[PDB]
Design a protein around this ligand. Structure first.
Ligand SMILES: CC(C)(C)[C@H](NC(=O)C(F)(F)F)C(=O)N1C[C@H]2[C@@H]([C@H]1C(=O)N[C@H](C=N)C[C@@H]1CCNC1=O)C2(C)C
Ligand SMILES: CC(C)(C)[C@H](NC(=O)C(F)(F)F)C(=O)N1C[C@H]2[C@@H]([C@H]1C(=O)N[C@H](C=N)C[C@@H]1CCNC1=O)C2(C)C
Lengths: 296, 300
């Protein structure tokens, strides 16, 4: 299964941030609360916000930060790209070992969706090639974060900011830089055409072989360029030599050369599943990374 | 629309490691009791045809090693309830949540916190299948992992993991040690029965599709429970009951599609398939969202 990481280490960091009439989630790590800067916007500000001007007018006491039933005293504030950093009185005693990481398209992570500072649910997802997330976010969900956990260290990679017209989601890393060409402004924008994460589909096919299914293999191989010429006709991402190298261990462990697995994928695209499933799915799964495969 | 699990933090603080001889699995630590599958008291060879009464008599407190992180918990008593072992320990879990033990029905969903060596590994959302199995993801050492729901700070534990059947699906007990399904904790040939699709959940998921603006499958027709159930039996779908209809009532009122109107859509989808089209991006009809699940996610 696509699994999320256990969310407890992040649940202990979620807080509520309110400025005027607008309330969203904040991330409380040590003595800083991170949250999307449009918390300082009213409704008349969303179309063309001047964030420098909106922020200079705020005092510390304009920011109401609540961690459960406890109010946290804001003692300083600062804007870093599209994220606000609220310095508070108190270091979060539940701060886990953590770091901030900016991820690349195709990378997976877990999302803890929150409202009013309290967690609602957790799910796994991927950063799409068009720098969006196929998330599940409602009003008040901004400031929810995405993360991985490695040896009890939480790497925060995503903070939620907005929803695009096709229902997909856009946000920033924890230094406030958007993924993709989006802005925290309620102006017309749209995700680029989204493609399938080819390297993840192939890793998942290798996972199927490791799991003992081989029905989709064939006797063909392919050059890299012929594979990409075919796959791009199905809106699959081009497979780079770096992707080929990445799959090397899985290729060695199964004895199926990467370009031979590429030939199998070409045939699967041409034929479909003919009523079969692969690892319990009737679709070609692309939100499972080569790293994820080895780690499960 | 995402398959979302509950936040797992309240449960993570209850997972411990239980070892009896060579056999190690996970245990659930609530106040001063650790709950785990009773087959922990088995050697590999015992598991082929165990006599649990006798194997438990021969054991003492000193046969059990319980580890909560870096800390050993001393076992001061032991007993069995059905297929669950209960280890009384010298220290009450200071992270014990408000909780209840509940037994769920086929078609109900829950989150699983997958654990190995007492350490939580991942969380995912599951349904109790009509054939009482669960389509989980469980490896060696996963026994004792639990499934749960949360309602307002109270964790309702409903599943504890015991075994994997030859089709790769899974069987376990409630926290009182009562099996779900006709399975026994013995390493002997057993198999999942033929499964069916959870009709009330497919309907809930069609309401979620409508809520999300996916409306092409709606049609002008209505049907009856009797007529729908005749086509349901044909396609290996759980018969739809009057309880299912009232349970769907709120979704029916939020969307303006009467429940019997939606059943006609599902009927049509079941016979003619899809014209290649998708619903919520899905090629198949999804049945692991309950009506409550759809309301929670669509309302936050
Ligand atoms: C969807 C809406 C048309 C309203 C708008 N979108 C676009 O303007 C775009 F289309 F350009 F993206 C949009 O998301 N916002 C408008 C305003 C913030 C953001 C916003 O309300 N964020 C919410 C945080 N709590 C999460 C949203 C709520 C609905 N579902 C979500 O995930 C900012 C971009 C500054
Ligand atoms: C799969 C195996 C053929 C080994 C066997 N299955 C059947 O005997 C069945 F077919 F009858 F079910 C089986 O699961 N067990 C045999 C033995 C316990 C159980 C068991 O090892 N449980 C594991 C607990 N850590 C979790 C398993 C590990 C693999 N994936 C899992 O989920 C008991 C039934 C007493």
């Amino acid at each position: 299964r696509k699994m999320a990481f256990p969310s407890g280490k992040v649940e202990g960091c979620m807080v509520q941030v309110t400025c005027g009439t607008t309330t969203l989630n904040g991330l409380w790590l040590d003595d800083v609360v991170y949250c999307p800067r449009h918390v300082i916007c009213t409704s008349e500000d969303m179309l063309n916000p001047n964030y420098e001007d909106l922020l200079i007018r705020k005092s510390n006491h304009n920011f109401l930060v609540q961690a459960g039933n406890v109010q946290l005293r804001v003692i300083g504030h600062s804007m870093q790209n599209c994220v606000l950093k609220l310095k508070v009185d108190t270091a979060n005693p539940k701060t886990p070992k953590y770091k901030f990481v900016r991820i690349q398209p195709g990378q997976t992570f877990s999302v803890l969706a929150c409202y009013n500072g309290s967690p609602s649910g957790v799910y796994q997802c991927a950063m799409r090639p068009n720098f969006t997330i196929k998330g599940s976010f409602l009003n008040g969900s901004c400031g929810s974060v995405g993360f991985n956990i490695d040896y009890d260290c939480v790497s925060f990679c995503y903070m939620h900011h907005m929803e695009l017209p096709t229902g997909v989601h856009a946000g920033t890393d924890l230094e406030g830089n958007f993924y993709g060409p989006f802005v925290d402004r309620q102006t017309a924008q749209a995700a680029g055409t989204d493609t399938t994460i080819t390297v993840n589909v192939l890793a998942w096919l290798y996972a199927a072989v490791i799991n003992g299914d081989r029905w989709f293999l064939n006797r063909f191989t392919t050059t890299l360029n012929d594979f990409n010429l075919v796959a791009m006709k199905y809106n699959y991402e081009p497979l780079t030599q770096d992707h080929v190298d990445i799959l090397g261990p899985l290729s060695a462990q199964t004895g199926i050369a990467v370009l031979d697995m590429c030939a199998s994928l070409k045939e699967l695209l041409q034929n479909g599943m003919n009523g079969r499933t692969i690892l319990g799915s009737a679709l070609l799964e692309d939100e499972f990374t080569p790293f994820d495969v080895v780690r499960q």
